[PDB]
Amino acid sequence: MSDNNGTPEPQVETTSVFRADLLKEMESSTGTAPASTGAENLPAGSALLVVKRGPNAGARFLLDQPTTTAGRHPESDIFLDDVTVSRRHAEFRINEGEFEVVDVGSLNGTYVNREPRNAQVMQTGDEIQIGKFRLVFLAGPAE
Numbered sequence: 403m404s405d406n407n408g409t410p411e412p413q414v415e416t417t418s419v420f421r422a423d424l425l426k427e428m429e430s431s432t433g434t435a436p437a438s439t440g441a442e443n444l445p446a447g448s449a450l451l452v453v454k455r456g457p458n459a460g461a462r463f464l465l466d467q468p469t470t471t472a473g474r475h476p477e478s479d480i481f482l483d484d485v486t487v488s489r490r491h492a493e494f495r496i497n498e499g500e501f502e503v504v505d506v507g508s509l510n511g512t513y514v515n516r517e518p519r520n521a522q523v524m525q526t527g528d529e530i531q532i533g534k535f536r537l538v539f540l541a542g543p544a545e
Contacts, residue, residue, distance in 0.1 A: 406469045406495065411477055413489035420485070420510045424534040428516065435516060438527030441541060444499050448542035449526065456535030457483040464542050465501065470494040472532070473507065485510070485533050492532070494524070501539075503530070 441449070450464035463480055472480035473491035484491065491507035492514075501524035505512040513531035514522040522528075526541040 406493075408469075410471075411475065413475060415474070415487050415489035417488060417507070417509045418486045422510065422534070424510075424531075427534060428513070428531065436527045436529065436538065438525065438540070441501070441524065441526040443541075445541050445544035447499050449501055449524070449539065450542045451480070451530070451537045451539045453482075454529075454536045454538050456532070456537070459535070462540075465494055465496060468496045470496070482532055482535070482537075492530075500524075 448464055448466050450462050452462035453459045458481075465479075467479060470480055471478045471490075471493045472482060473488040474481070474484060475489060480494075486509070488507055488509055491509060492503055492505045492512055495502050495504060503514050503519070503522040503524055505514070505520045505522075508520060510533050511518050513519065515525070515528045516531060524539055526539065528539040530537040530539060
């Protein structure tokens, strides 16, 4: 298996391709880059992402489902307010306890681990830049 087993909902929306200045702000953020290890240890087989800056900043969401879609979508588990309406910006796919980010937008330029990435293998401590706001991916509950 490889694809999301079920039905991804097709979306029609108009996305503007960003030519943004936020890359300068990313550079202003250059200082320390959090690094964590132990993602493959799997605390409870789950992982969470905390909004460090953004509309929902301060909230942490946990990925408990095998497929987590992010962006504006009626069925997106991770709802983030974009600058435009991103019907499909990124999805986090959980396969055998491993987390992969697949960017299905590249519209703003998805940065995963602070770098533009179309497909990413997630690690704890990974920083995801969605628009001009950022999410920090952390290992989930160790309950």
